[PDB]
């Protein structure tokens, strides 16, 4: 079927110029740097070094180049990806980005100076589909800390390694009342859910028990690396030192969890707090965070490597929790109006999943009074407005809505 692909792209010409193949490939939304295309691109480079002709691939030479990644290339070229007309869709992404750009309100988080420093005018959006198709607009290569955006990810790691039953013996599954917002613990002495601070503190104590903080951290970072397809994941020591210095509320919670015996036997509470502040201080960009979201969108498989990272159980539970508990006190309105699993963070990040379709990261630093990014909230509403993405939006009958699949 390397043969068939040749005929498709050639346009009845004898030979295909390299740049024409590359251009057609990029228009699918794949990137030439995609890890699943490595053999093909290695072969194009090499044959460019060794070639008799200029840039022209004849049937035989194209076959040489694509054969190892032929299945993925034919999917791309046939239009079998989740969003077949990716170019049209990315143009829509850009307009929504421009519209949200206008929304100038909100306040940058200043409780530590690493958050305070960020310009209010930083605004980026990245997309990664479940087939690995990519796009980005605005400030999508600027590093920033996940903060509470790491909470679903470490809950995923916990459930993956340990199972639903073990995890939920320590942490609940439900949104607390709009009037149990300030309660550390529910009636069973369990924190309400893994997306509040007390719940995430307990989740942090479940991961990789019985090794030191360095190894625990290495384990989580290696896991984050796979979810992001080995795109950027780093660490802000400066952020960490600040979080630790001013984490009075989290120390309060940790002492209370200790008193109510909420930790697994043998836990060093102060050491778990330290780990917690480190996980908060992990750095991403919009582009790498979008792939992490897309992994969640894809049932636990990283769409740009094809690697199994998370179990189906881990992903399902994480999405359910992000649905109901992921946007602080705006979670109910968010679920009603947007209808997508989403997690916000105090850096202005919103990690957004569109199950079966794609993953997003939206970043801008000024926050609204709920602590959610202003541009990001406006973007997510506008995205649902446009597209049939909502949770309960009918796949066959959708009104004036467009359907891109169809054609701390």
């Amino acid at each position: 079927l390397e043969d068939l692909l040749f005929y498709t792209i050639a346009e009845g010409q004898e030979k295909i110029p390299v740049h024409k193949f590359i251009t057609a490939l990029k228009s699918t939304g794949l990137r030439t740097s995609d890890p699943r295309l490595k053999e093909c691109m290695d072969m194009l480079r090499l044959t460019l070094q060794t070639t008799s002709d200029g840039v022209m691939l004849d049937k035989d030479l194209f076959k040489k180049c694509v054969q190892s990644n032929i299945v993925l290339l034919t999917q791309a070229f046939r239009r079998k990806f989740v969003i077949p007309d990716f170019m049209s869709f990315t143009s829509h992404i850009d307009e929504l980005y421009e519209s949200a750009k206008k929304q100038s309100g909100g306040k940058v988080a200043d409780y530590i100076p690493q958050l305070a420093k960020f310009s209010p005018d930083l605004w980026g959006v990245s997309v990664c589909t479940v087939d690995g198709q990519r796009h980005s607009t605005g400030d999508t290569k600027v590093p920033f800390c996940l903060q509470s955006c790491v909470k679903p990810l470490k809950y995923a790691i916990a459930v993956n390694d340990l199972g639903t039953e073990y995890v939920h013996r320590y942490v609940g599954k439900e949104p607390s009342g709009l009037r149990f917002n300030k309660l550390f613990l529910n009636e069973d002495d369990k924190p309400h859910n893994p997306m509040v601070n007390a719940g995430a503190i307990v989740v942090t104590s479940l991961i990789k028990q019985g090794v030191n903080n360095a190894e625990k951290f290495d384990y989580v970072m290696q896991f984050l690396n796979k979810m992001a397809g080995n795109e950027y994941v780093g660490f802000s020591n400066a952020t960490f030192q600040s979080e630790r210095e001013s984490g009075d509320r989290n120390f309060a919670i940790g002492y209370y969890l200790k008193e109510k015996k909420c930790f697994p036997e043998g836990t060093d509470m102060v050491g778990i707090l330290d780990f917690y502040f480190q996980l908060c201080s992990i750095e991403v960009t919009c582009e790498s965070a979008s792939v992490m979201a897309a992994t969640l969108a894809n049932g636990g498989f990283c769409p740009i490597t094809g690697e199994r990272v998370l179990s189906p159980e881990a992903v399902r539970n994480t999405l359910s929790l992000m649905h109901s508990c992921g946007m602080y006190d705006f979670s109910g309105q968010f679920a009603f109006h947007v209808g997508l699993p989403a997690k916000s963070g105090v850096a202005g990040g919103i990690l957004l999943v569109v199950p079966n379709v794609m993953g997003m990261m939206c970043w801008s630093p000024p926050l609204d009074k709920m602590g959610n990014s202003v541009k990001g909230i406006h973007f997510c509403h506008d995205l649902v407005s446009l597209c049939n993405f909502h949770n309960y939006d009918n796949l066959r009958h959708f009104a004036k809505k467009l359907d891109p699949r169809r054609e701390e």
Copy 2:
């Protein structure tokens, strides 16, 4: 070339003629029923010609009016292509929940207390109108709280989200009112009472009830919908909590201006006392599953906004204090009622009704709860299951008060 000739050749199986019984049998195994409103012209034509064996020309005369729907059915286009295998799975889950004898039948009124604990039905209607039933599926029972998503859908269809949500909130919560002096959501009693006062304002109760009943008829594709006066009289008599709620709503000025609150409570009780069966309630669920189109008639009944909102609310607040646990484990919008009904939606796939009177300590039906758990264990149907990658799970969209 002909569409009808193509279908004739596939059913004939290269033989000279198709007997009528063979066509009917083949049609039934797709899940459609011969009383399907969309197949009426075909079935009328069959009646006429029968007044046993059909040839190309005669089959074509019978099927031509309904040829598109029939071709979808026979070319395995439906949402569940292998429906017989799926109904075999449904039957297994039914038998398993049947053995789950726990729970208590509600007895706050005599009409509820009368029902046997042994009654147990499950009905399915897909978004293509494919139908299955097991157990006690033609036994009328009161909707009770199951009517709450239906009347909220009506209110949002008629008035819009913005107007409705001036009076009632949109999030899961003892208290009658949130911080803003609105009831928390249309799914609780307080929100349902306020929703009831939004519908068809400025006409008497008798006209309001007629309007709602006509709307319900369309939702159920004209299958069974009725009303228990006896339940209504009992509900009114014994509804002290609802009167308490109503007088608090009035005090806090929660109703639209010109509201007679004691009249609204009567209408609310009547709406609670509406009767369905499993079969007809499954069609109303399928209407919700199908974007507001009724899958058996093809009629548009509810706006997309109304259905989306109703599903959102059924998700978070549909099964009393088990709503949180239910969302996490089952992952499907669902409403339960004190008669033991669970009205279950699987968006883009199907509508279900499960009925069994004994309730658990949360108010939800024992067998129905056990059923919905097992359904999701077996099938990829959870909201946050993945369509391309899922566990040991079966995907029936694919060929194997």
Copy 3:
């Protein structure tokens, strides 16, 4: 040597005979009124002998004897300085100053949820005092009638405990203040109303009184009780207020239906009938003067100080004071208990019924209410009273700083 004789000498001051007006003015300066029911023999005899006298208006030692003998004990306590406040004139002078200072406080808002409340003038302000010995004083608008409203709640609770006992009553109703985080809940965890001083507890207390008879008879029974507490001074009924109250009582109907749902009433209760009776009890009218005597009865352990009659059991009074202490001034109850330290009840007419146990009762009336629903003038007055005099619960009798002590000479 005779009790009547010795009294004669002390008032006489060595003169052979006492002019009547001299006896009267001396009697009044103790703080008693000539209209006092326990003085009735004496005053009837003075009037009679005025008609029959050869020497009118002057009083012979044997004529004084004839006049005073029946009421000699009480008059000797008055004239000896054996009353709870011996220098009553100096005290009333202080009451006057505190009254004037409160008068100048002119913020607040007249209630207006019903037209009967609405219409009252914001500048009405009256204070009356009745000591535990029947000594009386009044300043400002103290003969103007107004509804008790929630000021009737400790009174109706007192009647319930009097007739039925603590044990029976508190099966139906709690003993504790709600808290701000159940400020809006009708029932506690045990499904009881939190205390008799909130509307839901008051409704339930209303259902306990004189069970088995019709509303007219229940009403009459409570009115006679009220008449006794007030020493037969003015106690009336506003039908206009009652009709208004039942018309706009959404809140209380909500509560009544919830109480019915949770089985909070005694077996056989007609809850809509109970609500009618409750609205009637809210609509009872007092003046400052008569309500002060009601508060004085509570100050005096259930005896009415101006008639000497036993009205309430010691248990009933003690319970009522304990509840008034902790739960009597809506959401200001905690702040009031800390700063004033006196059992007190407020009402939406701008009434504050105030007890100083073992000393006096008071009624403070002014209609404008602050945010908590308490009378602005009354609140200002209660704080000022406590600043001046050592009448806070936890003020000390032997040691107290720059406070004065009256007991010493010196809806």
Copy 4:
């Protein structure tokens, strides 16, 4: 017109020309005063001098002359409880009746509490005139624990004033698990959160050791220099296991509930030290009696606390003294009271007396079972209740009148 000392001598002499020392001493004890009373030191020093046998009008006068006012008060029956002997016999009955109340669990969160015997039971009384009585185990040291809370609040109000103190802490009962009220202030000095903030208030800008010395000296005055001490083993255990109090302290710190320059960790140390202060029933009754007496120590005469401090302290003890039981206790018992996890209840009867009751086993609410039973029995017997009428009471007895 004969001397005050001569008048007193003839009344004790009962016609006889001379008085035996022992006869004077017996008579004096019968008024409830103790021969060790600090106000009687001069008299007892004089008796010690002359005795190294009968006294006569002159030696007697020489002995009692400088304490004659207090002695005359005692002998003429001018003390707040004139028939003290009869009253102490009622106290003994009440004691014996509560002795039979075997139930309750001794606290065991800390080893030092779990050591105590369930059968220890003492009650001490100190009247506002210094009259004393004790039954049971009343000279055994135990920790104040939360009984300390009204005392250190009293100290803070005395030194700093009502308005300063209550910028930091509220004045009201909450049934709540919340650390702070709607205003971000802890609810009242009587809860842990409030007591930790009141701890921060006292003697600011000196080291912990100096702060503790100051509180100890203040406790000494309150107890009229009777027993006060410190359990270091309780302090160490208290600190090692106080996770809830660290949780509170970190939350008070986030919410900026302390005065600027507070070292929160250091405050918690101080707070644990205050909890670990030891008293006896006897000495604790005196501290209660100071509270009952308006801030004056009844056995010394010293002005310990200001009237504002005492009044505020009593008000708070009334509403929030007895943990969850508070509202119930106020309704039935009607007395300012505090209680502690060691089984202590400090009880005040304003203008009459202070008590301390101690018995280690606790009911479900945290209060001592014998203690609670004794407080109910006192109030049903006598008419100590705060809304009990002084003229009119029905078959109650009025000893004021001669018959963590």
